[PDB]
Scaffold this motif. Structure first.
Motif, PDB file in Angstrom:
ATOM      1  N   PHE A 179     -10.772  -1.994   3.070  1.00 23.08           N
ATOM      2  CA  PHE A 179     -11.673  -1.604   4.144  1.00 23.08           C
ATOM      3  C   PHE A 179     -12.550  -2.734   4.662  1.00 23.08           C
ATOM      4  CE2 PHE A 179     -15.797  -1.458   2.006  1.00 23.08           C
ATOM      5  CZ  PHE A 179     -15.417  -1.493   0.680  1.00 23.08           C
ATOM      6  N   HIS A 180     -12.546  -3.900   4.021  1.00 22.52           N
ATOM      7  CA  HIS A 180     -13.331  -5.031   4.497  1.00 22.52           C
ATOM      8  C   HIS A 180     -12.659  -6.318   4.047  1.00 22.52           C
ATOM      9  CE1 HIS A 180     -16.695  -7.533   5.687  1.00 22.52           C
ATOM     10  NE2 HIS A 180     -17.325  -6.471   6.154  1.00 22.52           N
ATOM     11  N   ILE A 181     -12.636  -7.308   4.935  1.00 20.57           N
ATOM     12  CA  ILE A 181     -11.914  -8.556   4.711  1.00 20.57           C
ATOM     13  C   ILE A 181     -12.886  -9.717   4.851  1.00 20.57           C
ATOM     14  CG2 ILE A 181     -10.154 -10.116   5.589  1.00 20.57           C
ATOM     15  CD1 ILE A 181      -8.906  -7.918   4.128  1.00 20.57           C
ATOM     16  N   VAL A 182     -12.933 -10.568   3.832  1.00 16.91           N
ATOM     17  CA  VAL A 182     -13.577 -11.868   3.925  1.00 16.91           C
ATOM     18  C   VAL A 182     -12.477 -12.927   3.872  1.00 16.91           C
ATOM     19  CG1 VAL A 182     -15.759 -12.964   3.319  1.00 16.91           C
ATOM     20  CG2 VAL A 182     -15.176 -10.743   2.358  1.00 16.91           C
ATOM     21  N   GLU A 183     -12.874 -14.194   4.015  1.00 16.68           N
ATOM     22  CA  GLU A 183     -11.885 -15.266   4.106  1.00 16.68           C
ATOM     23  C   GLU A 183     -10.997 -15.332   2.870  1.00 16.68           C
ATOM     24  OE1 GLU A 183     -15.163 -15.855   4.604  1.00 16.68           O
ATOM     25  OE2 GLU A 183     -15.842 -16.612   2.659  1.00 16.68           O
ATOM     26  N   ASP A 184     -11.542 -15.020   1.694  1.00 18.85           N
ATOM     27  CA  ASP A 184     -10.769 -15.050   0.461  1.00 18.85           C
ATOM     28  C   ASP A 184     -10.926 -13.808  -0.403  1.00 18.85           C
ATOM     29  OD1 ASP A 184      -9.712 -17.616   0.980  1.00 18.85           O
ATOM     30  OD2 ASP A 184     -11.476 -18.588   0.112  1.00 18.85           O
ATOM     31  N   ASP A 185     -11.863 -12.918  -0.093  1.00 16.43           N
ATOM     32  CA  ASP A 185     -12.137 -11.742  -0.907  1.00 16.43           C
ATOM     33  C   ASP A 185     -11.679 -10.492  -0.172  1.00 16.43           C
ATOM     34  OD1 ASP A 185     -13.450 -13.419  -2.806  1.00 16.43           O
ATOM     35  OD2 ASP A 185     -15.268 -13.321  -1.581  1.00 16.43           O
ATOM     36  N   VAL A 211       1.067 -15.685  -1.808  1.00 14.91           N
ATOM     37  CA  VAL A 211       2.329 -15.258  -1.213  1.00 14.91           C
ATOM     38  C   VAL A 211       2.070 -14.020  -0.366  1.00 14.91           C
ATOM     39  CG1 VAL A 211       3.894 -16.299  -2.873  1.00 14.91           C
ATOM     40  CG2 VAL A 211       2.844 -14.095  -3.386  1.00 14.91           C
ATOM     41  N   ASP A 212       2.590 -14.029   0.863  1.00 17.80           N
ATOM     42  CA  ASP A 212       2.421 -12.924   1.811  1.00 17.80           C
ATOM     43  C   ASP A 212       0.945 -12.626   2.061  1.00 17.80           C
ATOM     44  OD1 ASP A 212       5.180 -12.813   1.823  1.00 17.80           O
ATOM     45  OD2 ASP A 212       5.279 -11.133   0.414  1.00 17.80           O
ATOM     46  N   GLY A 213       0.126 -13.678   2.107  1.00 17.91           N
ATOM     47  CA  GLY A 213      -1.299 -13.494   2.309  1.00 17.91           C
ATOM     48  C   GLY A 213      -1.681 -13.110   3.723  1.00 17.91           C
ATOM     49  N   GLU A 214      -0.792 -13.336   4.690  1.00 16.04           N
ATOM     50  CA  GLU A 214      -1.115 -13.065   6.084  1.00 16.04           C
ATOM     51  C   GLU A 214      -1.058 -11.584   6.434  1.00 16.04           C
ATOM     52  OE1 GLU A 214       1.428 -14.621   4.927  1.00 16.04           O
ATOM     53  OE2 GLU A 214       3.184 -13.459   5.537  1.00 16.04           O
ATOM     54  N   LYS A 215      -0.417 -10.760   5.607  1.00 20.63           N
ATOM     55  CA  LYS A 215      -0.262  -9.341   5.896  1.00 20.63           C
ATOM     56  C   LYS A 215      -1.279  -8.471   5.165  1.00 20.63           C
ATOM     57  CE  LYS A 215       3.850  -9.873   4.873  1.00 20.63           C
ATOM     58  NZ  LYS A 215       5.321  -9.680   4.754  1.00 20.63           N
ATOM     59  N   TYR A 216      -2.260  -9.075   4.499  1.00 18.81           N
ATOM     60  CA  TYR A 216      -3.357  -8.327   3.885  1.00 18.81           C
ATOM     61  C   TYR A 216      -4.456  -8.186   4.928  1.00 18.81           C
ATOM     62  CZ  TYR A 216      -1.233  -8.672  -0.741  1.00 18.81           C
ATOM     63  OH  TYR A 216      -0.391  -8.557  -1.821  1.00 18.81           O
ATOM     64  N   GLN A 217      -4.441  -7.068   5.642  1.00 17.05           N
ATOM     65  CA  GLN A 217      -5.379  -6.804   6.723  1.00 17.05           C
ATOM     66  C   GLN A 217      -6.141  -5.514   6.440  1.00 17.05           C
ATOM     67  OE1 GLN A 217      -5.697  -9.199   8.830  1.00 17.05           O
ATOM     68  NE2 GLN A 217      -3.806 -10.321   8.377  1.00 17.05           N
ATOM     69  N   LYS A 218      -7.061  -5.179   7.341  1.00 17.68           N
ATOM     70  CA  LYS A 218      -7.851  -3.966   7.187  1.00 17.68           C
ATOM     71  C   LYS A 218      -6.958  -2.734   7.253  1.00 17.68           C
ATOM     72  CE  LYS A 218     -11.531  -3.463   9.485  1.00 17.68           C
ATOM     73  NZ  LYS A 218     -12.184  -2.931   8.261  1.00 17.68           N
ATOM     74  N   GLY A 219      -7.184  -1.803   6.329  1.00 17.04           N
ATOM     75  CA  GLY A 219      -6.405  -0.587   6.255  1.00 17.04           C
ATOM     76  C   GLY A 219      -5.098  -0.702   5.503  1.00 17.04           C
ATOM     77  N   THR A 220      -4.730  -1.894   5.047  1.00 11.20           N
ATOM     78  CA  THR A 220      -3.493  -2.060   4.300  1.00 11.20           C
ATOM     79  C   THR A 220      -3.634  -1.483   2.898  1.00 11.20           C
ATOM     80  OG1 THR A 220      -3.180  -4.118   5.531  1.00 11.20           O
ATOM     81  CG2 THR A 220      -1.706  -3.701   3.674  1.00 11.20           C
ATOM     82  N   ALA A 245     -10.469  -4.699 -11.147  1.00 10.80           N
ATOM     83  CA  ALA A 245      -9.068  -4.394 -10.900  1.00 10.80           C
ATOM     84  C   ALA A 245      -8.343  -5.684 -10.552  1.00 10.80           C
ATOM     85  CB  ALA A 245      -8.905  -3.363  -9.780  1.00 10.80           C
ATOM     86  N   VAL A 246      -7.016  -5.643 -10.664  1.00 13.92           N
ATOM     87  CA  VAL A 246      -6.169  -6.787 -10.361  1.00 13.92           C
ATOM     88  C   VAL A 246      -5.092  -6.353  -9.374  1.00 13.92           C
ATOM     89  CG1 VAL A 246      -6.598  -7.921 -12.567  1.00 13.92           C
ATOM     90  CG2 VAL A 246      -4.660  -6.372 -12.330  1.00 13.92           C
ATOM     91  N   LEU A 247      -4.527  -7.338  -8.682  1.00 12.86           N
ATOM     92  CA  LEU A 247      -3.516  -7.090  -7.664  1.00 12.86           C
ATOM     93  C   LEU A 247      -2.122  -7.217  -8.260  1.00 12.86           C
ATOM     94  CD1 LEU A 247      -4.920  -8.945  -4.535  1.00 12.86           C
ATOM     95  CD2 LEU A 247      -4.945  -6.509  -5.032  1.00 12.86           C
ATOM     96  N   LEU A 248      -1.283  -6.215  -8.011  1.00 15.02           N
ATOM     97  CA  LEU A 248       0.117  -6.257  -8.405  1.00 15.02           C
ATOM     98  C   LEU A 248       1.047  -6.416  -7.212  1.00 15.02           C
ATOM     99  CD1 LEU A 248      -1.502  -4.412 -10.645  1.00 15.02           C
ATOM    100  CD2 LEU A 248       0.805  -3.830 -11.397  1.00 15.02           C
ATOM    101  N   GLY A 249       0.505  -6.498  -6.004  1.00 15.49           N
ATOM    102  CA  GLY A 249       1.283  -6.648  -4.796  1.00 15.49           C
ATOM    103  C   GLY A 249       0.786  -5.699  -3.729  1.00 15.49           C
ATOM    104  N   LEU A 250       1.579  -5.563  -2.674  1.00 18.86           N
ATOM    105  CA  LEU A 250       1.293  -4.647  -1.582  1.00 18.86           C
ATOM    106  C   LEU A 250       2.073  -3.348  -1.767  1.00 18.86           C
ATOM    107  CD1 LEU A 250       3.863  -4.853   0.840  1.00 18.86           C
ATOM    108  CD2 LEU A 250       3.136  -7.214   0.411  1.00 18.86           C
ATOM    109  N   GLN A 251       1.581  -2.284  -1.130  1.00 18.10           N
ATOM    110  CA  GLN A 251       2.205  -0.973  -1.270  1.00 18.10           C
ATOM    111  C   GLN A 251       3.567  -0.960  -0.590  1.00 18.10           C
ATOM    112  OE1 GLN A 251       1.540   1.636  -3.165  1.00 18.10           O
ATOM    113  NE2 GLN A 251       3.504   2.385  -2.377  1.00 18.10           N
ATOM    114  N   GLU A 252       4.578  -0.467  -1.304  1.00 12.94           N
ATOM    115  CA  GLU A 252       5.952  -0.446  -0.804  1.00 12.94           C
ATOM    116  C   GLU A 252       6.161   0.836  -0.003  1.00 12.94           C
ATOM    117  OE1 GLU A 252       7.958  -0.610  -4.472  1.00 12.94           O
ATOM    118  OE2 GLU A 252       7.133  -2.566  -5.040  1.00 12.94           O
ATOM    119  N   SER A 253       5.934   0.739   1.303  1.00 13.15           N
ATOM    120  CA  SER A 253       6.114   1.884   2.188  1.00 13.15           C
ATOM    121  C   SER A 253       7.589   2.261   2.275  1.00 13.15           C
ATOM    122  CB  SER A 253       5.555   1.595   3.585  1.00 13.15           C
ATOM    123  OG  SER A 253       6.185   0.473   4.178  1.00 13.15           O
TER     124      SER A 253
END
Ligand SMILES: [K+]
Ligand SMILES: [Mg+2]
Ligand SMILES: [Mg+2]
Ligand SMILES: [Mg+2]
Ligand SMILES: [Mg+2]
Ligand SMILES: [Mg+2]
Ligand SMILES: [Mg+2]
Ligand SMILES: [Mg+2]
Ligand SMILES: [Mg+2]
Ligand SMILES: [Mg+2]
Ligand SMILES: [Mg+2]
Ligand SMILES: [Mg+2]
Ligand SMILES: [Mg+2]
Ligand SMILES: [Mg+2]
Ligand SMILES: [Mg+2]
Ligand SMILES: [Mg+2]
Ligand SMILES: [Mg+2]
Ligand SMILES: [Mg+2]
Ligand SMILES: [Mg+2]
Ligand SMILES: [Mg+2]
Ligand SMILES: [Mg+2]
Ligand SMILES: [Mg+2]
Ligand SMILES: [Mg+2]
Ligand SMILES: [Mg+2]
Ligand SMILES: [Mg+2]
Lengths: 72, 86, 137, 97, 99, 122, 49
Positions: free
Chosen positions: E29-35, E53-62, E91-99
């Motif tokens: 719900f909120h994006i900073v340059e690295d957080d 990896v695939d850092g460009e597709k982490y946007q608001k609402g993802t 929490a830790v990141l395991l990737g993006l949600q597989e739609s």
RNA sequence: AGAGUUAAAUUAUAACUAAGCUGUAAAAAGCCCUAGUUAAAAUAAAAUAACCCACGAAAGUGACUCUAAUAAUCCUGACACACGAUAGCUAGGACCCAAACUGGGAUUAGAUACCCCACUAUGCCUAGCCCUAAACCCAAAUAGUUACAUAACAAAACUA
């Protein structure tokens, strides 16, 4: 003053059956010879109460405690 | 006196430098606390002072190791504030 | 290049020979670095003394001999006398804690003598003689 | 009449308490290897709890077992026995940096 | 009318059990340059860093996948009557949600 | 077993080593002890030089004897072994198997202690 | 139960009759109590050497 | 409380080399019968473990081993009985090392003080006495409560 005989089985290993049929080796290992002063006190306390007390199974009675303190 | 020699508190130089080997030896003694122990055995401290020294060493070790945990615990809260001028 | 800090145990047989002789055959350089003087003596593997030097014998006198430079000069002088008798490598044993420990170590290095092992044999009583009282300076 | 209220039971998610390295094991003064792993190889000092990691029961027993071997003549006092210098490392102290 | 006690029994939070080592999906719900401020449905918002990896597709609402460790970071220090909360979650990141 | 005899012997050949053990066990039996078994730990280099009977020893053999003996006869056994010259260092300890390994449950974590000071404004 | 195991253990005790045999047997069968411990708590026996 | 035992250091002592060695902010005095290395009794004191908090009524106790062993079926109690660190006294033994007193050096206007060097009582063992401490955790013993409620400060308040 009392003198527990040396060649006597300690308090615990008395009522178990089949002791007199065992060789002298195990009887020696259970007698007061291979037992420290602590086991000697048990035999003194056991004999002393059986000679003066009326009901030995009662420990909370005053007479029983007086016998216990006298041993110490 | 009775033990074998050149086994305890011994290091060997490598590639021909000696300043590096000596610093390794000092870290061995400092970690085991011998360096401070030799300092305190130059003179004699009465048992009254010894316990008063162990009540200041222990207290410092508690405060320092507790303030250290709080710093690490709150370390993540140092990112740029996302609500500046909110 | 696997290098082990621990010395080669005499019981085993380690193929690490300096100048054609074993580890225990190499002479010893005893360093007693007190708080007022630094004494350096080199002895053979059979504990036969070769050369002796100290800050006092090198001209330094009184407070001056307790400084690091005095210990550094003693290391240079002791190595030169030792090298004259034909010794290349030496196992240096440091005795006590004092201001001359560092200087004497590198003093032998710059005096034409090569060291391979460093040992600290500071007298550490395990409970021993009661030391002197404190100084209320 | 409401069966949805919580019942007074103990916590079912209580993970078992951590066991020390020497838990349920019998230390002895005759096995030098076990006693030697908790001694600094360069000096011969005995590591504390913050380095050894043992509990409060097996730390005192190790200390008493070690000191018994010191006098009875079973292990060196001022250094670790070089024969057991290659045993697996259990302490958490690092000298080389 | 459903009693409040029945609501807690069937709630997803109660069915989760202990919060340690649970795979929970969340929404950014909120994006900073690295957080990346991620909401996983818990009380607070966890913070994670953008992967390389695939850092460009982490946007608001993802939607992303998380491994919850502590629902709310909170510890007690000596001399403190009340614990000092951090108002965040771990929490830790395991990737993006597989739609 | 009740008592354990941590026996260290001077390094020597097979015949005299057997003789030394033979008389050492004989001394124990004279004092009223029933020895259970004899355990051999082999010969090893001593951790440090031990001075005994005007000698400096660096190598010795280790032997272990466990027995049941009366409490009052321990001093006599220790005194007898001190006079013997083929034993370098005798020591007697209670057998470790006499005590049972106390059951353990785990490392109970101690919570930090609160309410150590008043709640006044510092 | 305790006296029963002592009954069996009494057979292997060292008597003056077999004082030589036990001593000779002991000198030929060395044994060691040495065993190491790993981080996970597993016992490592050096007898595998 | 008894009995047995010694790892690390130190010293008597011997060999070898060296001419200096100890000491301070800086020096002098002292030593040169000395210092370094190797070999080594006795006496005394008990590194690391201990970032543990156990035992005893308190004072106290933390090198190893063995023996003996820690009252009360579990309230309060003196001027009575028993005990009581360290210093001190009487008799015998031990003396590495530390060390009041004393002598020397230095500092200072003076220094019968701080600092440096030497050495004694003594610290130690056996038997007896003395019965004093900031013997203070300045918080009496036994049962309890977290209610009521902040003089100040400290180690929160209170009932029988
Ligand atoms: K000690
Ligand atoms: Mg010694
Ligand atoms: Mg006594
Ligand atoms: Mg002069
Ligand atoms: Mg000398
Ligand atoms: Mg003498
Ligand atoms: Mg304490
Ligand atoms: Mg009481
Ligand atoms: Mg009691
Ligand atoms: Mg009373
Ligand atoms: Mg007194
Ligand atoms: Mg006194
Ligand atoms: Mg006195
Ligand atoms: Mg008088
Ligand atoms: Mg006298
Ligand atoms: Mg004297
Ligand atoms: Mg003196
Ligand atoms: Mg004067
Ligand atoms: Mg007190
Ligand atoms: Mg008072
Ligand atoms: Mg009081
Ligand atoms: Mg009272
Ligand atoms: Mg009471
Ligand atoms: Mg109370
Ligand atoms: Mg105010």
């Amino acid at each position: 003053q009392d003198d527990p005989p040396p060649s006597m089985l300690l308090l615990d290993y008395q009522n178990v059956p089949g002791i007199h049929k065992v060789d002298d080796v195990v009887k020696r290992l259970l007698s007061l010879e291979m037992a420290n002063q602590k086991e000697k006190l048990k035999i003194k306390k056991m004999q002393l109460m059986n000679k003066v007390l009326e009901n030995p199974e009662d420990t909370s009675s005053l007479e029983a405690r007086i016998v216990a303190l006298t041993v110490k | 006196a009775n033990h074998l020699k050149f086994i305890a508190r011994t290091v060997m130089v490598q590639e021909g430098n000696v300043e590096g080997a000596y610093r390794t030896l000092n870290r061995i003694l400092t970690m085991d606390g011998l360096i401070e122990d030799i300092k305190r055995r130059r003179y004699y401290e009465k048992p009254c002072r010894r316990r008063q020294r162990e009540s200041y060493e222990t207290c410092r070790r508690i405060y320092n190791m507790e303030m250290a945990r709080k710093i690490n615990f709150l370390m993540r809260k140092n990112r740029a504030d996302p609500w500046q001028g909110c | 290049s696997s290098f082990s800090i621990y010395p080669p145990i005499p019981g085993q047989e380690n193929s690490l020979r300096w100048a054609g002789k074993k580890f225990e055959e190499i002479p010893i350089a005893h360093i007693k670095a007190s708080y007022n003087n630094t004494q350096i003596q080199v002895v053979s593997a059979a504990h036969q003394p070769l050369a002796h030097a100290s800050c006092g014998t090198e001209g330094f006198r009184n407070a001056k001999k307790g400084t690091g430079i005095a210990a550094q000069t003693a290391g240079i002088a002791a190595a030169a006398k030792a090298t004259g008798k034909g010794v290349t490598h030496v196992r240096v044993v440091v005795k006590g804690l004092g201001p001359g420990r560092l200087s004497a170590i590198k003093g032998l290095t710059m005096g034409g003598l090569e060291v391979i092992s460093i040992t600290d044999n500071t007298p550490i009583p395990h409970x021993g003689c009661r030391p002197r009282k404190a100084r209320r300076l | 009449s409401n069966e949805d209220l919580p019942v007074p039971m103990e916590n079912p998610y209580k993970e078992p308490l951590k066991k020390c390295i020497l838990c349920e094991k019998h230390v002895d003064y005759k096995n030098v290897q076990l006693l030697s792993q908790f001694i600094s190889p360069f000096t011969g000092c005995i590591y504390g709890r913050h380095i050894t990691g043992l509990c409060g029961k097996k730390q005192k027993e190790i200390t008493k077992a070690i000191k018994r071997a010191q006098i009875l003549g079973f292990m060196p006092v001022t250094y670790k026995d070089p024969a057991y210098l290659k045993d697996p490392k259990v302490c958490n102290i690092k000298y080389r940096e | 009318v459903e009693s409040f006690a029945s609501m807690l029994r069937h709630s997803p939070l109660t069915q989760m059990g202990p919060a340690k080592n649970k795979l929970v999906i969340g929404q950014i719900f909120h994006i900073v340059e690295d957080d990346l401020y991620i909401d996983f449905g818990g009380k607070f918002h966890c913070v994670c860093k953008r992967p390389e990896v695939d850092g460009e597709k982490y946007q608001k609402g993802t939607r992303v996948r998380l491994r919850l460790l502590d629902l709310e970071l909170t510890s007690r220090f000596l001399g403190a009557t009340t614990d000092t909360t951090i108002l965040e979650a771990d929490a830790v990141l395991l990737g993006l949600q597989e739609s | 077993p009740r008592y354990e005899l941590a026996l260290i012997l001077k390094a020597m050949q097979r015949p005299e080593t057997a003789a030394a053990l033979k008389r050492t066990l004989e001394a124990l039996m004279d004092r009223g002890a029933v020895v259970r078994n004899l355990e051999n730990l082999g010969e090893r280099m001593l951790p440090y030089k031990i001075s005994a009977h005007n000698q400096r020893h660096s190598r010795g053999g280790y032997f272990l004897v466990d027995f049941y003996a009366p409490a009052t006869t321990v001093e006599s056994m220790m005194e007898h072994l001190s006079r013997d010259i083929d034993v370098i260092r005798p020591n007697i300890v209670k057998h470790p198997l006499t005590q049972e390994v106390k059951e353990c449950e785990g490392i109970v974590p101690v919570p930090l202690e609160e309410k150590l000071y008043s709640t006044k404004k510092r | 139960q305790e006296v029963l195991q002592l009954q069996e253990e009494a057979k292997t005790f060292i008597t003056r009759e077999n004082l030589e045999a036990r001593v000779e047997e002991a000198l030929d069968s060395p044994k060691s109590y040495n065993w190491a411990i790993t981080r996970e708590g597993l016992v490592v026996r050096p007898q595998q050497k």
